[PDB]
Amino acid sequence: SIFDKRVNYKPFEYPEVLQFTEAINKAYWVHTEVDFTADTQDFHAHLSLAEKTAVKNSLLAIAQIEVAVRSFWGNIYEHFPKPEFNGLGSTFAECEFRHSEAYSRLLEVLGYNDEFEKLLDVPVIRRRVDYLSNVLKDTRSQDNRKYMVSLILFSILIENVSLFSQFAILLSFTRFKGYMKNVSNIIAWTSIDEQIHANGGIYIINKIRALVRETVKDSIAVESDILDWIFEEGEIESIKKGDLVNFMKFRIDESLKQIKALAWFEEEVFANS
Amino acid sequence: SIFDKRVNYKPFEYPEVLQFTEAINKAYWVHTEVDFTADTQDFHAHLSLAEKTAVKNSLLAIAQIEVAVRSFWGNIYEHFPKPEFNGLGSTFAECEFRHSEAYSRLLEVLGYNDEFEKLLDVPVIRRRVDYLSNVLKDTRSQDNRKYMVSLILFSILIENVSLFSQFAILLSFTRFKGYMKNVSNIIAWTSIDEQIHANGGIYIINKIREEFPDYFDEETLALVRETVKDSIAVESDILDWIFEEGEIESIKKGDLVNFMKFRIDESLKQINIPVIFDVKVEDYKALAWFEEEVFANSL
Ligand SMILES: [Mn+2]
Ligand SMILES: [Mn+2]
Ligand SMILES: [Mn+2]
Ligand SMILES: [Mn+2]
Known part of the structure; x- marks a missing residue:
């Protein structure tokens, strides 16, 4: 089975895995390629307080x-x-380290390390953490039935839902305003990698073939409250919170189908790619 | 300390980690960037039986x-x-998967899968596997001192010497004969990666020496030096199996043994461990072309 340890390296019992690693390989990128001087000038002078907060x-x-x-x-x-x-x-795992370094840099260049330190003071962020840490309780469980339960939640929300909401907000400044072009490059490259991490999760789930889908509907409530915190200074004009919820509803349905004024997202990702 | 868990991402307690990861990032490569058709033609036509076997x-x-x-x-x-x-x-870890795929492919192209499946039947290889097992027996130990011993032997053997003898053999065909240049691309790229791995391991060893100098007692230094001296005996017997069909003009076994001994000694100096062999400039300069050949086959 898939849970049994095979000793010989090749042939690969699941040769389709190379399609996911090679996709990450061809999309290889690091944050040191990108210069954020123009984005700091756009941020300082041409973005409203509600846009800066978003x-x-x-x-x-x-x-x-x-x-x-x-x-x-x-x-x-x-x-x-x-x-x-x-x-x-x-x-x-390596790709996620390139991601963590890229958003560690962005927090540094925009001067938000202090807010990231005390991020759990925000009640809604503390709500997503208490949510996420509990629903993924068995990611290390030796029980092969509830470890599978973790991979389902990990691939459709951590990789598919809990981040693409904030990816579209940042890409909208480049789409409709032509601002934050370099930040959107990091965002476009990240969403591509997360799309591959999701398909790799979906691919495995299909190879192991109630508690799941009404656990993930709980996240739409917390992800909607996060949008209230993102737009606490007012709704900006490039995107609206109501459309992002439908964008969140669209992505969850297509994730389960393999196991909208925000249809421009895929087109905007490959333009900044 | 280095064994204590830190929850916050940054600031990094050991920021020099980024020097090693960025080096891997800048030297990033996959084997599908190279084609071996030209090398199979040189192998088929312009290589003797002794050179093929090597x-x-x-x-x-x-x-x-x-x-x-x-x-x-x-x-x-x-x-x-x-x-x-x-x-x-x-x-x-990702770097090693690019390596495993690269040499998996070389075995496939040159048609050596059957001999790789039966490689344990070679006695000198079984001597290396049982020897490497004691070099890795404490790689999962929760004893920080036992795990530090495995970390030292991992960096100086698996990452820095156990492969560089075969690396130089293959590069020698490109430098002196002009053959196997695509194979030399994989070898040079891999040798750069393993150098970063060994230097990254040396960095961790020295940082443990900073925080825990009592871990470098007399017993640890004696076991490491004796285990290392046992390596050159097994690797020199591997050199006999590599040239089991005759001596080749590209390189000599005597230079390869002095090559490994010098690399081992340079490894021990960086972590302040007494030199074992002390190879003279009379001997280790015969393979001094290895560094520049790696760089020439990297671009
Ligand atoms: Mn990520
Ligand atoms: Mn991911
Ligand atoms: Mn390797
Ligand atoms: Mn290595």
Whole structure:
């Protein structure tokens, strides 16, 4: 089975894994390629306080997940002891380190390290953490039935929902205003990697073939409250909170179908890619 | 300390980690960037039986270490619970998967999968596997002193000497004969990566020496020096199996033994361990072309 340890390296029992690692390989990128001087000039002079807050809080919401020690992918070999899944996890774990460094830099160049330190003082961020830490309680569980339960939640929200909300907000400043072009480059490259991390999760879930889908509907409530915190200074004009909820509803449905004025998102991602 | 868990991502307690990860980032490469058709033609037409056997057995010995599930670097966060070392471990773990795929491919192109499956039937390889087992027996130990011993032997053997003998053998065909230039691209890129891995391990060893100088007692230094001296005996016997069909004009075994001994000594100096062999400039300059040949085959 997939939970049994195969000793020989090749042939790969699941050769489709290379499609996900090679996609990460071809999309390889680091934050040191990008210069944020123009974005700081656009930020300082041409963005309203409600627009500054939307950029600040969206990046803080992204950093809450991205700026952390990521250990799920780097340990799937402990649960799927195959050489191809150790490489799948290795490639995703490295990519998450490039992500954590990129949003650690953005927090530094925009001067938001202090707010990131005390981020749990925000009640709604504290609500997403209490949510996330509990629903993913069995990511390290030796029980192979509730570890699967973790990979479902990990792939459709951590990789598909809990971040693409803030990706579209930041990309809207480049789409409709032509601002934050370099930050949107980091955002476009990140969302591409998270799309591959989601498909890799979806791919595995289909290979292991109630508690799930009404656990994930609980996140739409907390993710909607996060948008209230992101737009606490007022709704900006490039995007609206109501459309982002439907964008969140669209992505969850297509995630489960394989196991909208925000249709421009995919087009905007490849333009800034 | 380095063994204590830190929850906050930054500031980094060990910011020099970024020097090693960025080096891997800048030297990033995948084997699909290279094609080996030209090398199969030089192998088929312009290589003797002695040179064929040296190329095949060297790559078999490399694949013996590289084509496997590598798990040491990807789990260094279990012993150094810092966000820095989880990123350092991930960056190195992904790097080994690019290596495992690269030499998996070289075995496939040149048609050596059957001999790699039966590689354990070679007695000198079984001597290396049992020897490497004691070099890795404490890689999961929760004893920080036992795990530090495995970390020292991992960086100076698996990452810095156990493969560089075969690396120089393959590069010698490109420098002196002008053959196997695509294979030399993989070798040079891999040798750069393993150098960063060994230097990254030396950095962690020295940082443990800073915070815990009592861990470097007389017993640890004696066991490491004796285990290391046992390596050159097994690796020199590997050199006999690599040239089991005759001496080749590209390089000599005597230079390769002096090459490994010098690299081992340079490794011990960086972590303040007494030199074992003390190779003279009379001997280790015969393979001094290895560094520049790696850089020439890297661009
Ligand atoms: Mn990420
Ligand atoms: Mn991800
Ligand atoms: Mn390697
Ligand atoms: Mn290595």
